[PDB]
Amino acid sequence: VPNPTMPVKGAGTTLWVYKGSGDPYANPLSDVDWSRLAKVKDLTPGELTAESYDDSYLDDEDADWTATGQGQKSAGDTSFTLAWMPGEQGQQALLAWFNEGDTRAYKIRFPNGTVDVFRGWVSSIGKAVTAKEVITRTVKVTNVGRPSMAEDRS
Amino acid sequence: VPNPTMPVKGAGTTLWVYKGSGDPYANPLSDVDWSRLAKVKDLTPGELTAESYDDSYLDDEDADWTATGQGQKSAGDTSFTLAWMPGEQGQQALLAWFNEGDTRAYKIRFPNGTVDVFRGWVSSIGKAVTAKEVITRTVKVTNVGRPSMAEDRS
Amino acid sequence: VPNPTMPVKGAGTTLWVYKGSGDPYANPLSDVDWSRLAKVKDLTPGELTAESYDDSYLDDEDADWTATGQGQKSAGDTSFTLAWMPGEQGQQALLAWFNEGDTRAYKIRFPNGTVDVFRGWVSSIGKAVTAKEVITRTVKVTNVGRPSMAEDRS
Amino acid sequence: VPNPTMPVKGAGTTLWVYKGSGDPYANPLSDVDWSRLAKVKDLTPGELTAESYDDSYLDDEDADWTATGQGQKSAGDTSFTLAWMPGEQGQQALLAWFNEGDTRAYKIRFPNGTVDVFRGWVSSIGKAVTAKEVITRTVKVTNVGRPSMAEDRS
Amino acid sequence: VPNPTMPVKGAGTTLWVYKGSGDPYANPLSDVDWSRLAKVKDLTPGELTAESYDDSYLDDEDADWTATGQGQKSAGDTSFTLAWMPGEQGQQALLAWFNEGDTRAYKIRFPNGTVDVFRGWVSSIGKAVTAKEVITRTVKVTNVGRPSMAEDRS
Amino acid sequence: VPNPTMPVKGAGTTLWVYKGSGDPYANPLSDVDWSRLAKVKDLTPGELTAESYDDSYLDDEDADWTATGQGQKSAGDTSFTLAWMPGEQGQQALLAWFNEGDTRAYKIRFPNGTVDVFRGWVSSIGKAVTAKEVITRTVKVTNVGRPSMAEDRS
Amino acid sequence: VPNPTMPVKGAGTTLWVYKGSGDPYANPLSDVDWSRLAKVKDLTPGELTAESYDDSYLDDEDADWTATGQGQKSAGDTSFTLAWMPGEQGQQALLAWFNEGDTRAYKIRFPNGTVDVFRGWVSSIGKAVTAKEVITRTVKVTNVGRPSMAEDRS
Amino acid sequence: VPNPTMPVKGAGTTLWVYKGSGDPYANPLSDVDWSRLAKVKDLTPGELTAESYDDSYLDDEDADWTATGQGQKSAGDTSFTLAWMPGEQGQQALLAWFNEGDTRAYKIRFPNGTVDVFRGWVSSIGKAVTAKEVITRTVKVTNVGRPSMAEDRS
Amino acid sequence: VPNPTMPVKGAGTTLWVYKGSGDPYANPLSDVDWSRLAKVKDLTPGELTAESYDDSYLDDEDADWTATGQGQKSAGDTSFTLAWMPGEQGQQALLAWFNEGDTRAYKIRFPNGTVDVFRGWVSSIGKAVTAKEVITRTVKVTNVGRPSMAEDRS
Amino acid sequence: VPNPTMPVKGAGTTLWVYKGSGDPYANPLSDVDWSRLAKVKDLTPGELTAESYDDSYLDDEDADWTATGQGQKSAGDTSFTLAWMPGEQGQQALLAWFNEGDTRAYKIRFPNGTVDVFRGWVSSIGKAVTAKEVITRTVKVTNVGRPSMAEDRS
Amino acid sequence: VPNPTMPVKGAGTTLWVYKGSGDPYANPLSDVDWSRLAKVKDLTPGELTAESYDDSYLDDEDADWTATGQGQKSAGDTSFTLAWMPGEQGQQALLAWFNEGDTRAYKIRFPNGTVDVFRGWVSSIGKAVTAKEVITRTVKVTNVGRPSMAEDRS
Amino acid sequence: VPNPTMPVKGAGTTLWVYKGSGDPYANPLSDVDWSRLAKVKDLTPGELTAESYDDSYLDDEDADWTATGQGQKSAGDTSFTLAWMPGEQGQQALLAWFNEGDTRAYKIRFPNGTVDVFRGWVSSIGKAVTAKEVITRTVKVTNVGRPSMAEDRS
């Protein structure tokens, strides 16, 4: 039985792409109108980050130690590699996404029972060919706006 | 039997270079008037990519999180290393391609049954000499314009 | 029995986050009004540092050797990785800390019997997903002001 | 029997330096008036390369994908390491070549039966001393002008 | 029996820090008024260095080969890592040294029988926490002025 | 019997420093008035090098391939590491050389039977301390002017 | 919550233009009858200034140091650049303003919660066209009379 | 689909020059009898401006603050640089325009779907010659009379 | 401890404006009846200067070299930029100072322990708005009469 | 093959000076009786220009917008820098041209296949001396009369 | 040992100001009755200059080339910046010098062993305040009459 | 071997000053009675130039294009910077030249093998002092009359 409180191993994660019209953040737990990408081999989700903003004046009584405040936050790049299946409707959606410069919403569903939703556009579409290994399609997606992390809902 | 839906191993890929007059994108599956480069030993196809365009104004109410949109897409470099056979027609075509700065169309044919076509010019011509190994000719080709990915056709 | 004089092994370290209103530096040994982050796997405490300030004049009789003085000190970044438990209260506190840009005080309690207090804001919130390993939450916290090292109290 | 069509292993390569007056490119297959460097232990021939020249205008109807053309070609550096024999005539010729800044023609004769001619000047002259290994002299030669690759003659 | 002429192994080196008023360079061999840092686990002493000053004119007959002269000498950084014992006097002296920027004199005493004295201020104070290893305190000290090498006294 | 024509292993090399007044290049083979540094563990002699000087005009009929000529040659840095013996004469000479910014001549005598002479000034004086290894003194010397390589004499 | 006492970052500023009949200075805080310019990318508000008026007589007892008084004050030029949207009612108002030489009142509304009102006429209407950037309309407005600065109201 | 309300990127702009007899302002959207200049590489359209007319009397009660009104409006200079093709019809038209001092009507057609018309005479004709770049023809045109901005038509 | 003899760093400077009736120069060390401007980011104090007065006659025996004497001294402009807080009393005092043309006395109190007093009137009041930076108020004040430099009191 | 219609790169330009008696404009394509300047390193051809002539009257019904007409055209200055070869005949011709104030015709022959003829007199003759660069002679030539641009002949 | 014939580096220069009654030029080498300014951080000595006097008549046969003769020589300005120490005697002397206009003699003493004397009056007194840098006092002094260069005495 | 026909690098130039009685232009190649300035670091020789003289009449049939003729030629300023050696004869000669307003002849001798002679008087004598650089003496000389350029002799 899935349990948010206890740790969970990573095997079982799925990746989804939104198609349709509506609010992706409204009800991420249901899968109606969410297309799926199958056979993902690697997945490194985006890394939220922030910039230091220098908060110092000449008036300040003491200047021995620095003082800074948080600046402009920004979600990073979410990159995954998945096996090459050009006839699947899923990968045709990826290249239609790339060619038509657009921002859609993609979802990560962990075995924990939680859901993680981002919005972004695709930045790279690569491939690797080796004699004795499956042909892989590597994708990197750049996020915009505010992600809806998993522990907002509780 | 080739099947686009299922994954495929990489062994069996071929590389072809176009000679003649016509439309390379019109009918890549046909093999007429396509010269072939033989005995490739490595192949890393080009990586499509795009650069971010900053979309922010002073008016916008929310400025905590960054907002960006897709910019100018560009295919990358395709580099392959193939055994040195200076008397073969294909490699003389390669150096004729390099000396006379020109853009031609080269094709990658996967065991999957699909076809991948690019257009570009050659950027590097190298060599490696070792006592106990076959002399290899390393080539890097820079693409221009819009590639024709294999999954456009379906 | 804990002993500040003798060396100590690292196992037993704990991490805490301050909640409430008061003076964090006043009495850190008490554990009231301090929330705790559980199941930390790695921890690298911040690195205090300073930058050189050039102290030279044309008058100086001797200029063969350089002469410098200490400049502006600054505590560094504290980064720890801890197992992903989105339903636990501590990690919801972490993301509330991140979303609302703010500076709080976090505490490190060593097995030695001493306490190390910092003040800072959170800079990065990341995650790593692998098939056969526990999903981890990686955090980096940037410090401001003057830390209260353990060596002050004695 | 040497065969340009089939692949060949690297053992048997020789290095030569032109002395005399004439046209090096006219007839490289002959071995008269070509001094030889003996006992070479590594050799990496130069890498021909070119740089991109941006070909874009504001008029262009389509600017989604980049468009570039080939720029200025340039042969690279040829570097080889050969055992230190200061009393041999070839290495005295090398240092006379270095001290008097000048461009000569050096030749690489592969076991394949073909010949590769370059023109250039010497850039580095180094040495390595180790207790249990032969003292080596390392050379790097920078090319100018147009090389005469082996694939021209056929 | 210690002997400067013959080589010596490194085990047995000690590190000392000066407290009091006087001339550190006057009599470093005496051990009075020199506090000691105990249980060091690594030590890389500073590296004296100098920067080139370009000495060339337009008049000079020969300009094929470069000509330079020595510039401004400067001792480097001395960094050592020692086990964390916050209750010991030496490490409280270290943090008092760091907080109040100041230049003091520290001494390295080799098993050879010689003494090495520097003057400088502290630049970094770090820590490393691991589950199965002793907690270590890493210090880096930046020197100023002229060091008193051991090779002066003889 | 030493032989310049044939290769030689590196063991047996010696390093010398000139003291006195005269011409170092006049008679390097004689060993009078040449002080010696003993017990050297590593030695990497300097690397002669040159700068490319761009030789191109707008008039030139062809500009497809680059054309360059040799620029300003310069001997590099000669660095060696030798065991720490502060009571020996040679190393006191090294520190007297470093403190008094000066250019002297140092000699390398190979087992081949040849001699290599440089002129230069010292740039670094470092040390390494390890628990179970001999204390080593590392020196780097920067050369000026024209070296007298070994195969000038024949 | 907006607070005049504390500093505020600049993001969120809006620009407005008055249409109708009434007193612009009477009630700037309400937005009835105030048209808005949207998507402003840069904004540098006007710089109030004054002229020195020479106050000196021959009678004056001392003339060693100058003495001056304030002259005729004048608000400067307020210039902003906003993205080109010729179909918006807002930008048509700008060009109707320019063609019909007139003085109207424009308003700046800061995130602080305050309001800044000027009166003036337009001096420049420019444009910038770049291949990969949004077309921008640059405007400069020259002010007349007395501005109603933000801290008049309190 | 072109849309005046939304912002547009600059790529796709065209420049046209009128030939024939009629009213340029009557129907600029139609493309008949408008010659075209091809391959523009830069374009900075003219900047409308006005000069202040001093409106102050001695009678006025208030003279602390300046008061001015708009004077004589005047379109500025329009300068574009386009690749040198002396055999094309457009550039021969340019030099015929320059030699015979005359005022014609030139049109700028944006990707937005709008049209901008000016009237003026040519002021400069320049050229730039570089070894590795396309020879460019730089033109500056001075406008007279009243321009017809694109947003008059709606 | 403050010390006029030794050099001092700039952090800790304060700016004050005189309100009330009395003699500003009489006792500036006291802080009563002096309003304060808070949060100053930059400060460039005025530059005392003088202009040359030509002292030459036709009689002078020697006229090869020029001869001049000092003319009329004049303090310059003091300009500081401070964060925009329109609800604070100090900045309302600044704009009341500007609107009513008047000369008051403002004071600079250095960390050294000394005081620098000027008298003057305000010349410029400006502002700068940026998306990611604090809104700043820039002021310039022009001095009259004789300043009371800190070096007078001792 | 040269083609006036298509763009061309600049490499291959030549500079010529007319000697003899005849009509320079009659047949510039021929190369007889035209001396040549060799080894030019930069060349910026003259910039044709004209000045505005104010065309306004008090009668004019409308005076809101300015109205001007073209004035007196004038070719600008042609400046080129070429390597210093005082023994060559061309540069002796240049200085004879300068010393005897006179107007001759100089020609620019582009790689395009066209010819550009001017007439003018020389204004500046300069030189630049640097230690590691070729001595250059810089010339500026001022044109008179009507140039014969390449676009006339077709 | 100081040596006028050989070049010297700048470090070690001192600046002195004369107090007392006598002849400054009589014996500048002696240091009695010369006050000293301490801790200078920059120094750019004055630049002697002269202005051309036009020497041409209508009679002269040759008027192609200009002819001029030297006019009125004049020493320039000497400006130095030195650390702000208002309690030191030298800087109180500086402001006493400024307030009471007066010409005194100041001396520059180079490490070369020579002495440079000027006479002049002070023109500017400035200051720079920065958060992390030493407060500096910038002075500019204008010379009168004839300087006594160091090259006179020999 | 020096060669006037071919280009030459700048290193090796010398600067000379004439002392004695005779004709400087008669035999510049001989080096007798020519004093020398040593250790010059920079040298920019004078720039010959001319003034436009307007040649236009009302009678002229055409006035569309300007017509001008050469006016009064004039050699410019020759400036060089050389290291400060006040005890050397040449620099005492420079200051004797400056103090006694006079015109002498100075010579530039290029590595090409040619000679360049000017006549003029000195205009500036400056100096630059830096902590870590050689003290430099900067001189600017203004020329009169007719220079004797290098390619007059052939």
XYZ file of C-alpha atoms in Angstrom, chain F:
154
model
C 79.819 3.341 -24.338
C 77.652 6.422 -24.875
C 76.415 6.932 -28.417
C 74.465 9.959 -29.710
C 73.136 8.044 -32.712
C 71.280 5.340 -30.770
C 68.413 5.793 -28.283
C 69.226 5.951 -24.574
C 67.231 5.370 -21.405
C 66.767 8.274 -19.034
C 68.389 6.957 -15.857
C 71.597 8.788 -14.952
C 70.623 12.393 -15.742
C 72.211 15.108 -13.602
C 71.306 18.742 -12.944
C 73.835 21.538 -12.449
C 73.858 25.247 -11.591
C 76.538 27.694 -12.726
C 78.551 29.750 -10.240
C 81.340 32.085 -11.280
C 82.052 34.524 -14.091
C 82.440 33.604 -17.741
C 80.510 32.348 -20.741
C 78.215 29.397 -19.927
C 77.802 28.549 -23.611
C 81.548 28.552 -24.305
C 82.442 25.132 -22.861
C 79.480 23.341 -21.263
C 81.210 19.952 -21.369
C 83.767 20.952 -18.735
C 82.511 20.577 -15.177
C 84.600 23.244 -13.411
C 82.777 26.002 -11.493
C 79.440 24.189 -11.951
C 77.648 23.489 -8.682
C 75.402 20.429 -8.574
C 71.923 19.676 -7.271
C 71.731 16.135 -5.909
C 68.952 13.560 -5.558
C 66.484 14.717 -8.201
C 63.353 12.565 -8.442
C 61.585 14.105 -11.447
C 62.622 16.404 -14.285
C 60.622 17.812 -17.201
C 62.801 20.095 -19.356
C 61.455 23.190 -21.022
C 59.274 23.181 -24.126
C 60.292 25.558 -26.906
C 57.315 27.124 -28.662
C 56.232 29.837 -31.087
C 53.286 32.122 -31.837
C 51.353 32.277 -35.095
C 51.589 35.601 -36.925
C 48.727 36.284 -39.320
C 49.968 36.959 -42.856
C 46.926 37.916 -44.927
C 45.990 40.849 -47.135
C 42.785 41.886 -48.944
C 44.735 41.843 -52.201
C 45.388 38.132 -52.084
C 43.910 36.309 -55.006
C 42.683 33.356 -52.928
C 41.459 33.358 -49.339
C 39.913 29.880 -49.041
C 42.765 28.490 -46.925
C 44.600 30.247 -44.109
C 48.220 31.373 -44.370
C 50.415 32.125 -41.351
C 54.067 32.547 -40.438
C 56.146 31.900 -37.342
C 56.237 34.611 -34.709
C 58.155 35.105 -31.468
C 59.788 31.942 -30.155
C 60.101 31.396 -26.416
C 61.550 28.707 -24.188
C 59.099 27.511 -21.563
C 59.309 26.484 -17.928
C 61.733 23.820 -16.717
C 60.472 22.166 -13.538
C 61.998 19.505 -11.292
C 61.371 18.023 -7.852
C 64.243 17.088 -5.565
C 64.412 15.736 -2.032
C 64.575 18.307 0.757
C 68.099 18.740 2.180
C 68.217 22.257 3.667
C 71.789 21.872 4.883
C 73.227 21.106 1.456
C 74.957 23.867 -0.478
C 72.867 23.481 -3.622
C 69.518 24.202 -2.013
C 70.793 27.198 -0.084
C 71.971 28.351 -3.507
C 68.441 27.788 -4.825
C 66.878 30.010 -2.182
C 69.579 32.649 -2.619
C 68.714 32.498 -6.324
C 65.019 32.956 -5.585
C 65.323 35.782 -3.067
C 67.708 37.798 -5.261
C 65.807 38.116 -8.522
C 68.415 37.038 -11.021
C 69.045 35.036 -14.184
C 71.673 32.294 -14.059
C 72.546 29.329 -16.262
C 71.629 25.747 -15.407
C 72.776 22.623 -17.214
C 71.285 19.185 -17.904
C 73.720 16.342 -18.579
C 72.111 13.295 -20.179
C 73.527 9.743 -20.166
C 73.797 10.081 -23.935
C 76.976 12.107 -23.462
C 75.487 15.453 -24.515
C 74.852 18.691 -22.640
C 71.877 21.070 -22.562
C 72.241 24.626 -21.203
C 69.542 27.187 -20.408
C 69.387 30.633 -18.812
C 66.520 31.669 -16.593
C 65.055 32.721 -13.262
C 63.112 30.770 -10.655
C 59.325 31.115 -10.428
C 58.118 28.671 -7.760
C 59.503 27.051 -4.619
C 57.113 24.537 -3.107
C 57.111 21.632 -0.693
C 55.039 18.512 -0.040
C 54.734 16.764 3.335
C 53.365 13.224 3.644
C 53.434 10.812 6.574
C 55.235 7.935 4.827
C 57.216 9.658 2.051
C 60.383 11.712 1.748
C 59.903 15.467 1.993
C 60.312 16.897 -1.503
C 61.240 20.369 -2.736
C 59.571 21.319 -6.023
C 61.130 24.012 -8.218
C 59.993 25.639 -11.461
C 62.393 27.792 -13.472
C 61.346 30.177 -16.245
C 63.813 30.579 -19.104
C 64.791 33.679 -21.064
C 66.758 34.275 -24.215
C 68.132 31.538 -26.444
C 68.801 28.042 -25.072
C 71.850 26.147 -26.310
C 70.342 22.804 -27.252
C 72.368 19.609 -27.281
C 72.638 19.069 -31.033
C 74.072 22.486 -31.806
C 77.413 20.870 -30.970
C 78.405 17.964 -33.211
